[model samples]
Structure formats: structure tokens, C-alpha cells
Target: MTHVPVLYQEALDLLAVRPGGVYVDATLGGAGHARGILERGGRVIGLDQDPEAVARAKGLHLPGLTVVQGNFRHLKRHLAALGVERVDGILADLGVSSFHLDDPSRGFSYQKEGPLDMRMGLEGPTAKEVVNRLPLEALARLLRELGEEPQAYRIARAIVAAREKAPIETTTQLAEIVRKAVGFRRAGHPARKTFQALRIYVNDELNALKEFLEQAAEVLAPGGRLVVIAFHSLEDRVVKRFLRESGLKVLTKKPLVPSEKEAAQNPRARSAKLRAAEKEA
Candidate 1:
């Protein structure tokens, strides 16, 4: 499936792109937004931690586009390596891409059965390690803190019990454990929150976001924009606090969300919230 850039035009407008200006697409999942920047006569320095994402984008042969494999948390280092001290704007979409969810082997989806591996890059502990190795208390805490899952204790208990019998090695195994623990719910899969928790924990997503937020403003030129699309309240809260405390002009007093039409067309976008701010000139 072609990855749709959420809040595409809204992001472009907020960035106030100018001809010949430089911009950074910090999470170049499918280069959808990178193409948007290039189309507007802007140069793009696109970064992604996932090599799969990078390879797919490199195939575009886009003009004024340079694709790099790296996490956006280290944006300063990546920019320095390119001799780009500052840019006109930076955009980060924090939601997991459709490519990751659709591919069962990547294990981001609860519906599809695959390995428990959820690492975005070649490195880091896989969800297998997290689920099979983490103690019941640690697992419960992660589920509660990262996922805000109400049945964290129950889910963690189930996982520990199951793993005692044998390693929880597959997505379906983990999902079944969560479903049995949480029972039936009115909306979405019972495993959704647990899966989300595991993925975030495996990737250290919140910490990376915090690091990126800390450095993003510093890499922007005066009056430059920083736009972020976050799919969860925890991420939005972090972005909101950083923007408010950084003294930058918050462009969106309230986050901009997708319209009903857009949400219907792109179901993944329903939970997305877009927040933007401008560095003081």
C-alpha cells in the first residue's frame, strides 16, 4: 500500500516553504512527505532508522532529495555531516507507517501473525526478549506506562504464565495471551494496547522522541517551523510541553486533526494529532 502522508498540505503550509529552501523530513517512512517538499522546489534531507524504509525511498530518484539511514533523535549529527547547520523546517510523523503494520514479519500489527520481533532497526532487543525475559513487574509497568493499558497487570500475568510453559515467540501467541487476559472489548482488538506497549518498549520510542524534541529547535533557522504528527496522547503531551516551554510561537494552539473524510479514507489517520511551532526570529 502507498503510504499517505498525514496532514500533508497542512504541514507544508505551516512550514512556509520557499524555493531553494532546505527542509528535513525526519521520519521518511515512504518519502511521501519528502516528495511533497521536493515538488515545492525545496531540498530535502530525509532520514529514517529503518533500512527498509530508506531503500524504498532511495528508489524514488527524486531531485534535491538525499536519503540517509539514521534516527531523527541524532538530527544534529546528521545535519552536521551534510554541512547543513540549520534548515527552514523539520517534520516528524510519529505514527508507525502502513508498511511496518502490513508486513507481518515486522510484527507491528495485532491482526496478522508473525514473529515477536518489533525492532525498527537492525539493533536493539526484539519484542521476543522483552516479552519472554522481562519480569512480571517490569512487564506490567511497561504496559501501564507506555501503553496506558488498563489491564496491564492482567496482561503481564498472562504473559508470564504462558512464557513459563514456553517462550512467547510469535505475534499470535502474544496477542492471544493479551486477549485472554483482557477479555472482550467494545472497540478494537483486545491485544492492541499490549502490542503498542511492546512495540514502544522495544523501540524506546518515547526516549527517542524526547531527544529529537530537545534538538529540533536548535537545528532550525530563525522563524523556521517544527511540525510533528503524534498518534498517542503521551507523545502529544511531550510535544505540547516542549513547544510551550521552548518559548517558540505555538502555531497550533490546539492540535489539528484529520477531517472526517480524511479519517474515513485513511483509517490509520483517525488518531493522529498535528502540532506545530515556529522558532523566534
Candidate 2:
């Protein structure tokens, strides 16, 4: 499957990568953005907490690139590990990669029935454990805050009630149960929100994004660009607020969206939002 980078050209243009300069693709995924940088003769340091992503990226054969299996939240330390203190720019396309979601066993998508393992890296709580273990109140808060699900309380109560009988073991099972609890059925899959909430909670993705932005800002060079492509409103809001409220100047006052044609070609691009900023000297 082709791992098409959403808003590819837009992300590259916003980054303004310089030839012979160093840049970092913090979420490096399948190294789509990193390859673009390397093709322009820019040195690229890419990070992905998932070892599988790092391994797959090795096949790209991009020169002047160092791909590490580590989280972007550790961008500062990861760069430091390469004996570099700062970089010209940083790019993060934050969200579940196509590979992760499509790989059913990883449990990132509601379409597939798989284990409740939504971890980006080997470490962290699995979604099954989180849903089965966390208190009903905690589950409600996570669903409301992370997934923006309106029926968080009801979903949480149902999950707690179900787990008393048997653990929510797979994505489909949990999704069906949640759908029943919320009485939601629509154009898309019924379990989208609850699964999203579980995945987010399992990965602690928002917190990692916060840490990455905070750390990268301090280490990004003057005039350095920080580009982020967020897939959902919650993440886009965090990126927007960070760029605007921080020392960095927001370069894109309005978030960039994919063209209608592009969205038609790749339905995944429908909700993509690209935001960028430049760090202060």
C-alpha cells in the first residue's frame, strides 16, 4: 500500500527546507517528508517511536538521513544523541499512520477486529487494559476530552458494565458495545469515537505532542519552521494554540486543507489540517 503523505506539497513548501541544511521529521512515519528533504540535499534526522516504522523507512535509501526508533517528544534528546544541539527545522505529521491502522493486529482501526493494543511503541498501557481497568469516571473523562464524544458518560458506564461480564478484548467487540451504549449509527463506522478515545488514551499522544512542540521550539534555529499536520480537531486545536500562544509566530493564520479533488482521491485527507510556525530568534 502506498503511504501517501497528506498535504505533501503543502508540508514541504511550508517547511522551506534548505539544501545542505539539517532538518528533522519528528514523526517520520514511512519517511515521506524526510525523503523530500534528502532529495533536496538537506540532511535529515527522522524519529519514529515505533521500531516497525523505522525499519520500513530503511528501504527508502535516502542519503544523509538518520532514522531513529524513538518518540518525537524526545526530539531534544534524540537530536542530542546524534551530537547535534539544534536543527534548521522540524516536521511532525501527528496521527496514526496508514500502516498502523491498516495492520489489523495493531488495533488502531475500528474496521478490523484485533487486539486492543493501540500502542505506538512497545511501552505503554494497551487499550484493552485501559478500558477494562480504568474507573468509569476516568473513562468518561478520557472519552470526553480526547475523543470529543458527546456520549462519554454513557459509553463509560456501558464499558464498565460490560467488563464486569468479560474483558473488552478486541476492537470490534469494544466498538459494538460502545455503539450499543451510545445508540449511534451513521455514514461511517459506529464505533469511531470510542475507539479513538481508547487509542488516544493508550498512546498518550496529545501529551507527547505537547512535549515535542515545547522542546523543539527551544532547539529549533532562528527562522526555523515547525510544521504540523493534525488529523482531528483536538490535535489541530493544540497545534494552533501552541503556535499562536508561544514565542513562535504563526505562519498560517488559517489552517491549510487539502483540495476537494485531493480529498476525493484520498478520503483520509478530508479532515487533515496543516499548520505551521517559525521560531523567534
Candidate 3:
């Protein structure tokens, strides 16, 4: 998949980057979106839990960029570390980068053959542990809730049955099991849902998103904008709910999606949904 940041222009436009404004690129994956802010005369503090992203950004030595290796949920604390109280805008792109998906060692893509280690930060219990360790019921429940996989129980049964023969330790290992259980789908890979569920669970992405939303509600100057581009319906729902309850004035009545032209060029961007809100004055 291409490395183009999803909803790149929509996210940047919604952020309303003012000249000399300070912005936070909370999920700074490849710094693609962050570079947009920088080029627009915004000073950006780019935060990413993935060390690879942080190192990559720092290695660029770009002016008006501060790269931090930490989760975006801790934006406020990271801001404090930089001695900043509030910023003009914050943008979080909740999709994994092409770097993550293309690299087999990260185990983010089911197509790749590697360890079941889908930890975004390369820390925490890996997908392997979740597959081999969880009870069948819990595993099924996670698949249902996190993946919305209707055949969760069937898939879970297959996983539990297979792992009994041997520990599920790699991406292809689990993928094959899920495929056999569900047959195959031409619409998408049979194992995509399972991989998503495991990755989100392992990285605690949903919880972190909620925390990021909470902190974002108050971490901006009055009239400042917050923009989020989420790839998952669960994360999009969390953002939608946060906009409703956080008392921020919603800037977009409905979420925005990448243009057909952009989506055609970047397949990974097809699922992106962007929503924006402003801290009211």
C-alpha cells in the first residue's frame, strides 16, 4: 500500500493551520500529515509511540518539528515536558503506516509471514500470546466486539483447536487457521478481521483513543481545532461520541472521507473517516 496519509488535505484543512500556529500531530506515523502542517507555517510537535516513526522524523532534521517517541494519549504530559500549555490545533491519524504493514517483522499485515507481534510500539503482549493464552469464550468475545466478526465463535473454536496442537506463534499460522474456519472471501481476506481484533487488543488502541479525545477536549486554546482520521468504525464511533459529550463545537456535521481519486491511488486510505471539532470560545 502507498504511504500517502489518508484524508491528507481534509485533515489539514480542518485543522486550520494558521501561520506560526503550534500544532500537534499526535499519531505522526510517517510525518506525512505533520509535514503538511509544517509547510503551512505551523510549528508541529509530532508524537508517535513507535520508535521507528520517531527516529525517522528526527532523522529528517526538519525545521519547526519536535519529534517525541510516546503515545498520543499522553499528549498533555508530552506538551508539559516541552513547557507548552496549549496549542492551536491537534491532529491524530489513527491508521497504521505503510511502513508497519509492509514490514513483515511488525506482523501488522496478514499477507506478511512473521511473528504474531503486532504491538504498535513493539511492546506489550503480542498477538501470539493473545491467540495462545485467552480462553475460547474470551477469544470469541474479543473477536465479536473488536472485530465485529459474526462468525467469531466459529473462528475462535478453530483457533483454540489448532493452538492445542501447537502454539500459534506467527501471522501466517493464525491466518491459515482463521481462513480454514471461515472458508475464504473474495471481498477480503478471511483473516483480516481476526488480525484487526488482535492488533487493537494488543496495542490498547481504543482505550488510548478515548484518553486522547479526553485530553484533546481541554488541551487546546479556545477556538483551536482538533481533527482525527480514524480507520476503524470503533475508533470513529469513539470520536463521534467524544464530539457529542465534550462540549466542543463540532466543525463537521458528518465525517469526511478521502476523495475517490485519492482512494484509488492509496488503497489503505479507503476506510479513513475524518471528523473535526473546535474548542469553543
lDDT of each: 0.88, 0.85, 0.88
- How many clashing pairs per prediction, in order? 0, 0, 0
How many clashes in candidate 3? 0
User: What TM-score does candidate 3 get on C-alpha atoms?
Assistant: 0.96
Please write out the lDDT profile of model 2 over residues 72-161, one tens digit for every residue: 888888889899998888898887765687799898877789898999888787998999999989999999998888888988999999
Candidate 2 — which residues are off by over 4 angstroms?
1-3
C-alpha lDDT of candidate 2 relative to the true structure: 0.85
Per-residue lDDT value at 276 in model 3: 94
Measured with C-alpha atoms, the lDDT of residue 76 in candidate 2 is 88
| Model 1 agreement with the true structure over 52-93: per-residue lDDT tens digits | 888988988888999989988899998999998989999998
Best by TM-score: 1
lDDT of 3 at 81: 96
> Which segments of model 1 are wrong by more than 4 Å?
1-3
Candidate 3 local lDDT, 113-186, one digit each (tens): 99988988966888888999999999999999999898999999999999999998888888899999999787
Model 3 weakest 10-residue run by lDDT: 1-10
Model 1's TM-score against the true structure: 0.97
